[PDB]
Symmetry: C2
Subunit: 216 residues, 2 copies
Amino acid sequence: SDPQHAARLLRALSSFRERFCDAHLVLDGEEIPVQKNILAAASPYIRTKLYKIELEGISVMVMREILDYIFSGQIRLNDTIQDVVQAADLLLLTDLKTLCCEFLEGCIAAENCIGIRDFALHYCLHHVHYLATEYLETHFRDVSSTEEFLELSPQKLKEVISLERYVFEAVIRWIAHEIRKVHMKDVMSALWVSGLDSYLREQMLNEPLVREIVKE
Amino acid sequence: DPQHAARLLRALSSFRERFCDAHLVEPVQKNILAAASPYIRTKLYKIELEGISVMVMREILDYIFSGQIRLEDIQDVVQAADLLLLTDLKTLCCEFLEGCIANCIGIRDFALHYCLHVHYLATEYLETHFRDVXXXXXXXXXXXXXXXXXXXXXXXXXXXXXXXXXXXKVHMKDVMSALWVSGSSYLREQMLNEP
């Protein structure tokens, strides 16, 4: 019995990176000699496409990290994450795709919150989207003070508020610019309605909101 | 994630059936086999093998993609390992022999022809139980030269053994002469029962 068998054998395959290379990966404007079976056995994409396997849009630097990942089991991630996910996506490396998801999760902050959430929607990272949605929900107050949430789009902010004072005082904070000073009427109108179901008019007018309130 | 090489090796195993860049004499994946066998690594296709059968080759070839062989009578599994230079395979074999003592004499002589601790662990069972060993079929079917080597190692039971070796006999004179100079109630006892 010896589970260290494959990890031993794979270390062997590793030094045959050079005679043994039966193909080339055509990325950027370069060719990379690869062992077509090993790459086939880990990338359902490369496999079905089975020489010159031309990859569409992946920095040669990332294929090396992904290629080393293939041989070691460890991926060098840190500014680069989304590069490695785009490739994990393209090549269908579920394994590696999960590590990137783990990594992305531990990065969730009050700035990489919305960002990480739009990004997770896009590559369809379900659980990652869940967590970032959640952080946003239970940390809105802080996010309110984020450049990601401020220079945001009015259509995005409308959905950000969607998810269940603290909010009414984030939409008004969303007016940095003569530019976003247009919906302020829509806010003061919503404010009245909410004040229907009180003490909210006062709790607001007790802050530098007055500045944006005055002009209107 | 120790679960890498093993999943990866699993998938590669599903190709054993487009990916075979070489034929073995006949059907394999060149890099894999060359990573597992230094011997095959140097022959670089048709890699012709010397002196192992197909059943045996198909055995090592499978250990390669699985991690473990189930073998269980070895004189050939090791015959091959030493040949293909599969080292850890021979180690798995050693573990299987090292603890198969009891087929206890031939082992010590098998481990020799193969330069195998296994030997050290064979001499130390024979070196001690030489008594019941004498009551074995191997030692009872042993050879002369093979005895001047065992008997002549680092004891009444010995002289008894050598006499307990004469089944029928032209070595007696050397035993008696020896016995005398050395100074056995077994032989004495055999006298009244023998012919």
